[PDB]
């Protein structure tokens, strides 16, 4: 692998030569959805920090 060009050892994508396409797709969706719910759990917490 040291003596071959980079296109042979990677794929033009995030985590190209490290993760497969489906595992990168699942990381992206999981990162987006989980972080979206983090905002929801924060605004909801602030809703219970002013009435209860």
């Amino acid at each position: 692998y040291a003596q071959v060009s980079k296109t042979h050892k990677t794929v033009q994508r995030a985590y190209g030569g490290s993760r497969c396409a489906n595992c990168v797709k699942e990381r992206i969706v999981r990162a987006f959805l989980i972080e979206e719910q983090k905002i929801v759990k924060r605004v909801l917490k602030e809703q219970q920090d002013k009435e209860k």
Partner: protein, 96 residues
């Protein structure tokens, strides 16, 4: 009771079975209700209800697994999720 309501919709109304069909029906705005089986992966589940939030669609959480959700629909296969396009003779949309 909802099993009886859901069975009537399959007999008389319109529906799609399967994750790929449900997401298409949420994109097109043709979904009236989304039913998700209990053993559906949470990542797929939390994504279906994000699509429904954008699409302004109610979500019903079936209590059984995809084996039980499939047999309620009169199918001999497993149904992880489904969308109701047209509740016909049933009143499932008014109950959920």
């Amino acid at each position: 009771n909802i099993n009886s309501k859901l069975a009537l919709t399959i007999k008389s109304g319109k529906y799609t079975l399967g994750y790929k069909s449900v997401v298409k029906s949420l994109r097109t705005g043709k979904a009236k209700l989304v039913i998700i089986a209990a053993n559906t992966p949470v990542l797929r589940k939390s994504e279906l209800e994000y699509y429904a939030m954008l699409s302004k669609t109610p979500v019903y959480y079936f209590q059984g697994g995809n084996n039980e959700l499939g047999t309620v629909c009169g199918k001999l296969f497993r149904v992880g999720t489904l969308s109701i396009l047209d509740a016909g003779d049933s009143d499932i949309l008014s109950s959920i």
